[PDB]
Structures are given as C-alpha cells and as structure tokens.
Amino acid sequence: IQRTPKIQVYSRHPAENGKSNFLNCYVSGFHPSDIEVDLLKNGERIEKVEHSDLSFSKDWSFYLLYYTEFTPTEKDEYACRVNHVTLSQPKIVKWDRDM
C-alpha cells in the first residue's frame, strides 16, 4: 500500500503581476522519503526551480520543498507537477492567487 501525495501551490508572499515573487510547492502525505515534483509554465518545465534542504518530521509526513523565483504576469502561468506511484497520472496543479 501507500498514500496519495497532495498538491499545494501558492505564492510564499503576496503575488504581484509585473513583480518578482517566490513560488512555493508543498507535496506531502506520502512514502518513502522521496517524491519528485517539478514546476511548470502553462505546461512546460521550469529549470530555475530549486529544492532546499529536505526536511525532518518527528511524526508526520516528511516534507519536500520545490520553489522558484519568478515574475508573474497576466499573460503567463506557472504550474506544479508531482510524480508518485499512487497517482495514476502525475498531478498537475496550476498556480493561482484567486483561483
């Protein structure tokens, strides 16, 4: 068995279009210590994505962080993709502030 990792995608601080911001993608609820998640743009992979030092959870799911520095716009769009054996298809969640 196993547990399905769930997707959260949101801006670490207030999102401003035409402004530099910090993305945050939190994929947790899963096993083992490893999950692979990538950040997208309308459908395509982001390369400047960086993952910080893994994590340490005393009891709950081990957390893994994937973020990128970006300049949001009205016209463009960024997404989160996660791959795990539980998800019959890798999960994509588009980033938004009001949606």
Side-chain angles (χ1 to χ4, degrees), residues 19-80:
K19 206 64 166 295
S20 299
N21 255 92
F22 288 69
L23 231 182
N24 176 272
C25 204
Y26 230 75
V27 205
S28 296
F30 69 79
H31 185 261
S33 59
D34 289 67
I35 196 205
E36 198 55 273
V37 13
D38 162 61
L39 312 182
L40 319 174
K41 307 182 286 186
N42 300 271
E44 307 296 314
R45 191 173 167 196
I46 302 174
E47 44 288 280
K48 296 261 169 187
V49 182
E50 303 183 82
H51 48 108
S52 47
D53 181 67
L54 203 279
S55 186
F56 180 74
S57 53
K58 77 180 194 70
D59 186 274
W60 312 119
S61 298
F62 326 86
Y63 324 90
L64 162 143
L65 215 177
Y66 269 99
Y67 64 91
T68 187
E69 188 189 285
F70 66 153
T71 308
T73 62
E74 215 75 86
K75 296 139 174 185
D76 214 274
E77 173 264 74
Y78 320 67
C80 270

